[PDB]
Amino acid sequence: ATNRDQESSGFAWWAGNARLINLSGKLLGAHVAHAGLIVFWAGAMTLFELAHFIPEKPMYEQGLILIPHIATLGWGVGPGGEVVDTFPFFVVGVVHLISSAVLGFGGVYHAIRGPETLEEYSSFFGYDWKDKNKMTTILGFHLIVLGIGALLLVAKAMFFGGLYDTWAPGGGDVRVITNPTLDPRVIFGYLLKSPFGGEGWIVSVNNLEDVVGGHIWIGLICIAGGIWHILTTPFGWARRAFIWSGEAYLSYSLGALSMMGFIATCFVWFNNTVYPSEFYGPTGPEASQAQAMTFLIRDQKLGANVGSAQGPTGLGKYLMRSPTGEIIFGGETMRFWDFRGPWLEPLRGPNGLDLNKIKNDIQPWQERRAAEYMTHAPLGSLNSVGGVATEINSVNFVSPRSWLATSHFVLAFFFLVGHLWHAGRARAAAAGFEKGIDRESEPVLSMPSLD
Amino acid sequence: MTILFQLALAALVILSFVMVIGVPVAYASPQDWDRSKQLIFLGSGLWIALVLVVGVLNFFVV
Amino acid sequence: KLPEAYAIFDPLVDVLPVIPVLFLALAFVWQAAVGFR
Amino acid sequence: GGRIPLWIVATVAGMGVIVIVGLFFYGAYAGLGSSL
């Protein structure tokens, strides 16, 4: 039971996994077994979603999060997001589930049967956290793997059938990307966009050419950087700036995953390009705009002149200006005038919403989509009663957007907490005071009084 | 091919449940490491074969 | 739905996604067995 | 003086709690209180 109690390891059972810090074999076991849990859930969850799936109801009325991910890659779907073939969903689910048994096998072997440390056994697989060279080398391998993953996405989009494109002219459809955006001024220009309203930083990406081109960049950057880290050792200023310890490295990764978690939350909440509304339901801004569109359509059918209709406040009941002059929907949705979506853009001219297009060119498919999106707004109760909070029971609905945003905000937040926990512990343990203050060397007793 | 397919899948299911218990028990067991190591190897090659058999028979039943 | 040939396995498929939760709960059974030492 | 290991008693007991609370959740969706 090598290190498997508090007396030996110095760590209580509830911090038991800290017993692994310097046991590279068992720690590799933990890691591989864990990757099996992730792959397991992906496969089992997909099969479950498929078993429950009624192809003619929208995905977003069915509590699906994984099928929508698969569909967006262009598997299983046709024009408008119509499901034409569930078999690809099946394949994805099965292949992950089978794969997780392999990973789970490796994990159990390393964790329980293999060498508890790897260093005696192998110098390629063994490691010391304080070995800066081995650390950047392993980091470099993983960078290359990630780079190849990003390029797989490019391969799908360009050579293996394309991606679902909500923006396809004539209507949403799978489309092969042939002219991916390579211009670094566009690709890196996204990184310098404001995260505030009407800008949206990277969340603003609104076409698949930029999406594909960015992963071309990212795949190349990751592979290059991975090579770089295999071939180099950290610079002096790097060595002086960081703590070099397993717990410190966990902490840097915790911060990064926290940040990424927050980013994903805003991505699923606002973006309707890589989270097509055909699959994920309308965004909050989209459904609110769809409501105004719905009543503009209705009342104008009844004979209202929607351009000149002054609402109770003096602002136009249907149509008003944004603070920079663009014609936008009125009522509370004035806040959502940065919204853009395929069903609405045909009505937009260089000055914003165009009154002549509004009066003459609204098609029945736009009315239908706007009514669908208004009535699938991402609002609903924790027990999945769809609607505002005062709604009566009947409609079993919570948008996949709310489930995905809320879950990722919770995760990203607790990951920030773990970052602070571990970054501050790593600092203290590196300096030697993580177990408490030395009673005979209490630093504050050697300092001058404040007053 | 259905009889064949369905047996092969129920067999995969069953062998999986057996491996799920037996691999960790074998691995943490003091005694029969020799008799176990062999069975684990056999169970595994068998598990893999069944997966490929199910995979192939899938197309003669779907 | 699953392709019809797999339908018999529907009830099993219904329960699999929860198995990860079981692994967390298993750590506690194990610790209770080793007296949380 | 023991004969049944405490870890078994806890595991069986814990599983019993999960079952009964699971049943209670099931019942939120069926019969009285289900909205249907």
Binding site: - | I21, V25, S29, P30 | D14, V18, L22, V29, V34 | -
Partner: peptide
């Protein structure tokens, strides 16, 4: 719900079964 209940029953017992077998056999827990 009998089919699903039986499945979750034997999936659920598998974990503690492993621990039990190992404990009986004085295994490396």
């Amino acid at each position: 719900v009998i089919a699903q209940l039986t499945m979750i029953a034997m999936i659920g017992i598998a974990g503690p079964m492993i621990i039990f077998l190992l404990a009986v056999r004085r295994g490396n827990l």
